[PDB]
Amino acid sequence: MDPEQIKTALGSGLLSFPVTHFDAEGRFAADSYREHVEWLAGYKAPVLFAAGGTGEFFSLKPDEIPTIVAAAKEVAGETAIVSGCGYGTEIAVDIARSVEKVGADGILLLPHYLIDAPQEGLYAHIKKVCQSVGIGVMVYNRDNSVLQADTLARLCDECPNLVGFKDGTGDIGLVRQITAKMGDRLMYLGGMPTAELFAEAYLGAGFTTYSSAVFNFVPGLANEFYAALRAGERATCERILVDFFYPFMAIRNRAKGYAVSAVKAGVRLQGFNAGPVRAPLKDLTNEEIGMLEALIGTHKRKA
Amino acid sequence: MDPEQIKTALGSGLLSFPVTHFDAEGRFAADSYREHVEWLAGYKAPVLFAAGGTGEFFSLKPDEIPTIVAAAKEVAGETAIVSGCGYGTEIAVDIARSVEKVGADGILLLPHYLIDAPQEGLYAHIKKVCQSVGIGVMVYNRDNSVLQADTLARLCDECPNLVGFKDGTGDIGLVRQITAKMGDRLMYLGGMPTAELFAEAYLGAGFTTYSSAVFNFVPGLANEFYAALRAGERATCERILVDFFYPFMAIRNRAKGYAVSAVKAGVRLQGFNAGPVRAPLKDLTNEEIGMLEALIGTHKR
Amino acid sequence: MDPEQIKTALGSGLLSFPVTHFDAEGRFAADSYREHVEWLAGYKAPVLFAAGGTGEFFSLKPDEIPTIVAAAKEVAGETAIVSGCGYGTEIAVDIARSVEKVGADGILLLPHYLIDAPQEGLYAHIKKVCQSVGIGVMVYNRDNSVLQADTLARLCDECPNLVGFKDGTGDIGLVRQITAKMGDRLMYLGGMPTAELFAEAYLGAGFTTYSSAVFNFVPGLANEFYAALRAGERATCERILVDFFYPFMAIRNRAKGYAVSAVKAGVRLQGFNAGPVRAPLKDLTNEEIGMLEALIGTHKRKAWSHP
Amino acid sequence: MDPEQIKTALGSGLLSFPVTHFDAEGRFAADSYREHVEWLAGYKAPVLFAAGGTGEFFSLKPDEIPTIVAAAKEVAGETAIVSGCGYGTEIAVDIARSVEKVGADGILLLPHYLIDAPQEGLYAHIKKVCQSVGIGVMVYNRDNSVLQADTLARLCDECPNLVGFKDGTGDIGLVRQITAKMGDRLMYLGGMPTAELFAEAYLGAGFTTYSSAVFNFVPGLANEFYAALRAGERATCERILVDFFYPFMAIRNRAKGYAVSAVKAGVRLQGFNAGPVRAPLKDLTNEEIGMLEALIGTHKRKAWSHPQFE
């Protein structure tokens, strides 16, 4: 689809970021991945982000990314498919063009690698990546890549296919300035780890959707929270925060990287063969897996 | 005033934090202060925080604080008066008791001095301050004093006069957890510098009021933004953000401490003899003062 | 003494920062304090910092500080006595003048309260404090008060009684620039928590002394480390780091504020009635006190020792 | 070269990290690179790190790295050549094996990409990279990859080819613990931006060498500072800090990334046209380059003929 079509899809519901399934040896496990993506499709997220952060983009070889995107496309149905992209410009452009070739509907551009960079340099890097493909681009403010509002405005003026903005900073002051400046030029995507913790506040900032990492393993629960959010049903949102998300957060905060590892553990507990995380992430301990299993509780998919 | 009455006042509108006026000899200028507070009273903020952060609490002698609270009480009329309080426990308790004596309706407890502290220690410190007075207390998550939700819950169970929670961290994740845990047990007060930049997001977190530092010199505009906020008139809030608050923010970000210095400059531009900031703050340059004057524009008094 | 005399004292050995003793009613326990200080005096630190950070300056009422300084001065012998000082300018000047009045030999100026401040404001604040007294002043780079080299040079040019610089930032790049700029105009004092962890590196930065917080309860060991440091006996320094200081660090890192709490626990373990820390610090758990007791080990204060 | 031989070379002097030269089309410019490396060779740094941070590792396509290493090897003489390496494990292993194939004498392992990771994960990642090659490895504590002493000890016990430790954290407390723990098991390399600012302090921590980024364009000055450092000649070190390094730092601090961009400008000023930096770095303005030119001053290795008519 064209960038305006992926833009419309970004504003039509909740965003799904599937974990990437690996076998015991760490290789991509396409059959298990497709089984899980097919199961998630029943819950009708309008956009699927293949090989995003939750999908361990940062541990994939560039040549693996189109294979993962193609696998998702096999079974995702009438769903927009966005690919992760990232690293420095040379690598990012090659990844972008490779996933465009296998039929991705857009790219989510993760930070460049390692260095702190001046705004002018961020502009030049992101412009070059946007101009390398015809599909839609979402930029991702996080870590060592944080666009100021004026820099983002310049990019929007020069790159018509730049259509989305994902925030992973939690900087409420900055993101409100960005939505005030750009208005409906961009779709605004919440991108904090466990984004439901931020979603009610981010409404006021101008964000009405987000990545739901836990949709990987409790999509019914994630969909219900999202529905309550958009309906203004505060007591329902709050009940789900108190009974599910703050307990999940307690597990997540036990170790670095568990924003991904705990989500992948949840997928395994629901009976999908998602396999291990790749180093330098680590998997949950048996004790922690037990905690998560108990938390999932009434939401188990099987016995 | 009993804690439940200050609690009600905290939920009845916008919060005012007047700058503290100093004269040429550097002392508190009570006549000038009272003139400014009397003018602000016309704009009907339900609660006035004397000697808070915007009032340069951090540069005041403990014995100056009751004097400032007393001056505010003279002219505030039907307005609740909350006093700043802070430092370590021994000093804080002395301040708290001293301002209760001159008629403060509550205290806002700023962080203790210098050190990073464990949750159990914050608990012990804040509990001792709360139990030293009968008036209402508002805690203030900021810098080296950040309460977790479970610690604040314990304080609420133990200290009935603890009735307010002010946030200066900007940690949306944490403050949403706090409002979910405590519910209507506490009044939630936005406390970021230039809090209007955060107000719409903080609604969703569970906060419907905040300190408006710029109410000091453009109270009419601050009231206009607040009314639009509570009415859900986003285009109006956004217009005021774009036309006033982000340009103000640009001036404020030129130097450390200007969250206070620029506000005080604004007060002087409106014809109040608020005087200089105390070191280690520094005042705006003449050029910067000119920028602020131009920004205030048609809100000139 | 005059500023040049305290300056000379700062360069004559290891720096002592006694914990402040509190009684059951929470009050300053002067008898116990004086007893502890008298014991420490036997280990010959040339400068004693009363009511510094380790002495819980940040939890003292201002009127308590001259009482504490006076108590240390009574029993410290021929030892320079420096008082903690801090907060905003108005409070700091009052504190400074009050401790000068009871015969403090200098002040260590802790950061102002709460706010971040422009360099020009730091300059104005510190200058006013220095000019309020005739005794020597040591500035203290840490937290929300960090002087750049040019700002400090300006203060040195205008305040002759400013004679010392303590670092609590751990910013090697900055502190080396400072010593290159000022040279022997200032005495440079290491001020990291558990400063022995930094001492060998700080030598190259231009610092040959530091506050030894653990001197409070193992003054012999602290002296042994300092002696080896100044003599270039790396194997000895390293042994003490591996056997004592990194294990101490493990205890210290278990909770916020334990850089003070664990030291006070050590003092109590060695038989000085220092009492609890004041909130918002917390004391070590019994389990943690147990860990510190084992670590002190052969350095335990024994009834049969000769003074 | 085996790992014990590169370990020995790491302890034999100052470390060189050449900028990577690009042409106007952005491509690696091997002829220019070799000319610059050949000039540097006269100053006899025992180890050259090709495609390190100063060499814009983070902006290279993985297939460029062996090409750059091979070019340096052409003209480096009897100098050890270490290659940059980095990213997540899968990419890092491919890079490591590719540069081993072209004859690198070791790899400097930069952080993995993006994420904060637990110590056990860092261990698993670095172990896998070390076991993928037979050449020497130096780990690099910086940004999102900071090994604690006990984790590093486990890596040392299991990976004999891990022989070096480079610090970019500036955490004196931690690095002194690490040298106390490992002793001569590892060679300790200073790795701060503009490492001369840290070198005297780092001696005490146990580090007697470092990467000198400015060696790229004032190697005579960098060599003199290093000799003074090792000799204990404090007044010489201090003069060079005051007259050159703190003024350099003032230029460097003008914008993000100038720790690389300013060094590359210096190389260009000395007559080696190393070309532009790759985005998202930005080059110094012509005004800023003029500031650096004035600072280089008596240390210029050429005179320019600027265009002028009548």
Q: Secondary structure of A6-72 in the HEC alphabet?
A: HHHHHCCCCEECCCCCECCCCCECHHHHHHHHHHHHCCCCCEEEECCCCCCHHHCCCCHHHHHHHHH
Is residue A128 within 8 Å of residue D279, measured between CB atoms?
A: yes
Which three-class secondary structure state does DSSP give residue C51? coil
Residue B14 is given by DSSP the state: -
Residue with tokens 């992973």: A168
Q: Which residue of D has its CA nearest to C233?
A: D204
Q: Is the dihedral of CA A177, A180, A185, A187 positive or negative?
A: positive
How many beta-carbon pairs under 8 angstroms link C with D? Answer: 65
Q: Report, in this order, helix, strand and coil percent for chain A, each rounded to 5.
A: 50, 15, 35
Give whole-number Cα distances, D249 to D217, D241, D259, D279, in Å: 15, 10, 9, 22
Q: Which of B144, B141, B121 is nearest to C279 (CA)?
A: B121
Q: How far apart are CA A157 and CA A160, in angstroms?
A: 7
Which three-class secondary structure state does DSSP give residue A209? strand
Q: How far apart are CA D103 and CA D37, in angstroms?
A: 17
Q: Which residue of D has its CA nearest to C235?
A: D180
Is residue C102 within 8 Å of residue C133, measured between CB atoms?
A: no
Which three-class secondary structure state does DSSP give residue C8? helix
End-to-end CA, chain C: 29
Q: How far apart are CA D135 and CA D10, in angstroms?
A: 14
Cβ distance A87 to D86 less than 8 Å, yes or no, reads: no
Tokens of B48: 């006035």
B133 residue type, one letter: V
Which three-class secondary structure state does DSSP give residue B189? strand
Cβ distance D241 to C201 less than 8 Å, yes or no, reads: no
DSSP letters for B68-123:
HHHHHHHH--S-EEEEEE-SSHHHHHHHHHHHHHTT-SEEEEPPPSS----HHHHH
Among partner residues B111, B112, B120, which is closest to C282 by beta-carbon distance? Answer: B120
Among partner residues A171, A198, A242, which is closest to B173 by beta-carbon distance? Answer: A198
Q: How far apart are CA A89 and CA A124, in angstroms?
A: 9
Q: Which of B100, B190, B98 is nearest to B140 (CA)?
A: B190
What are the helix (H) ranges across chain C?
A: 3-10, 30-41, 64-75, 89-101, 119-131, 149-158, 172-182, 199-205, 219-231, 234-240, 246-252, 258-269, 286-296
Q: Which of D208, D303, D155 is nearest to D15 (CA)?
A: D208
A93 residue type, one letter: V
Q: How far apart are CA D61 and CA A89, in angstroms?
A: 9
Show residues of chain B in contact with C191, CB under 8 Å. none
Q: How far apart are CA A159 and CA A153, in angstroms?
A: 10
- Domain annotation for chain B: domains and CATH numbers: 1-301 (3.20.20.70)
Residue with tokens 């839609």: A136
Residue with tokens 């090709």: D50
Query: CB-hemisphere CA count at 13 Å for A213?
Result: 28
Residue B195 is given by DSSP the state: G
Q: How far is B237 from chain A (nearest CA, A)?
A: 10
* Gyration radius of chain D over CA positions: 19
Tokens of A139: 């930029």
- C94, exposed or middle or buried, with CB in 10 Å at 0-12, 13-18, 19+? middle
Q: How far is D248 from chain C (nearest CA, A)?
A: 13
Provide CB contacts within 8 A for A164, sequence distance 6+: A6, A7, A10, A106, A108, A136, A137, A138, A139, A186, A187, A188, A189
* Gyration radius of chain C over CA positions: 18
Q: Which of C261, C277, C273 is nearest to C292 (CA)?
A: C261
Q: Which of A19, A143, A140, A114 is nearest to A71 (CA)?
A: A19
Is residue C214 within 8 Å of residue C246, measured between CB atoms?
A: no
Query: CB-hemisphere CA count at 13 Å for B82?
Result: 32
Q: Which technique?
A: X-ray
Give whole-number Cα distances, C266 to C218, C289, D115, in Å: 8, 8, 40
Neighbours of D231 (CB within 10 A): 10
Neighbours of B56 (CB within 10 A): 24
For residue D82, what are the β-bridge partners?
D49, D106
Among partner residues B177, B201, B242, which is closest to A172 by beta-carbon distance? Answer: B201
Is residue B29 within 8 Å of residue B21, measured between CB atoms?
A: yes
Q: How far apart are CA A170 and CA A161, in angstroms?
A: 25
Is residue B70 within 8 Å of residue B103, measured between CB atoms?
A: yes
Q: Which of B80, B101, B104 is nearest to B11 (CA)?
A: B80
Residue with tokens 């000019």: C131
Residue A242 is given by DSSP the state: I
Among partner residues B180, B192, B204, which is closest to A242 by beta-carbon distance? Answer: B180
Provide CB contacts within 8 A for D40, sequence distance 6+: D16, D18, D48, D215, D216, D219
Is residue D172 within 8 Å of residue D201, measured between CB atoms?
A: yes
Q: Which of B161, B210, B198, B155 is nearest to B178 (CA)?
A: B155
C232: left (phi over 0), alpha (psi -120 to 50) or beta: left
Tokens of D216: 């790229």
Q: How far apart are CA C216 and CA C234, in angstroms?
A: 24
In angstroms, how far apart are the furthest CA atoms of chain B? 51
DSSP letters for chain D:
--HHHHHHHHTSS-EE-PPPPB-TTS-B-HHHHHHHHHHHHTT--SEEEETSTTTTGGGS-GGGHHHHHHHHHHH--S-EEEEEE-SSHHHHHHHHHHHHHTT-SEEEEPPPSS----HHHHHHHHHHHHTT-SSEEEEEEBTTB---HHHHHHHHHH-TTEEEEEE-S--HHHHHHHHHHHGGGSEEEE-STTGGGTHHHHHHHT--EEB-GGGGT-HHHHHHHHHHHHHT-HHHHHHHIIIIIHHHHHHHTTSTTHHHHHHHHHHHHTT----PPPTTS-PPPHHHHHHHHHHHGGG-S---------
Q: Which of D115, D102, D58 is nearest to D84 (CA)?
A: D58
D209 residue type, one letter: T
After which residues, if any, is chain A broken (C to N > 2.5 Å)?
none
Provide CB contacts within 8 A for D84, sequence distance 6+: D49, D50, D51, D52, D53, D55, D57, D60, D65, D107, D108, D110
Neighbours of A31 (CB within 10 A): 11
Q: How far apart are CA C135 and CA C5, in angstroms?
A: 10
Is residue C217 within 8 Å of residue C270, measured between CB atoms?
A: yes
Q: How far apart are CA B92 and CA B89, in angstroms?
A: 5
Cβ distance A125 to D61 less than 8 Å, yes or no, reads: no
Q: Which chains does D contact via 3+ CB–CB distances below 8 A?
A: A, C
Is residue A213 within 8 Å of residue A54, measured between CB atoms?
A: yes
> Chain B interface, mutation test: which of C59, C63, C109, C146, most B Cβ atoms within 10 Å?
C59
Give whole-number Cα distances, B147 to B111, B144, B235, C60, in Å: 11, 10, 35, 23
Q: Which residue of B has its CA nearest to A207?
A: B201
Say whether the A–D interface has 3 or more Cβ pairs within 8 Å.
yes
Residue C114 is given by DSSP the state: S
Q: How far apart are CA C51 and CA C34, in angstroms?
A: 13
- Interface residues of chain D, partner chain C, Cβ below 8 Å: 170-173, 176-177, 180-181, 192, 197-205, 238, 241-242, 246
End-to-end CA, chain A: 40
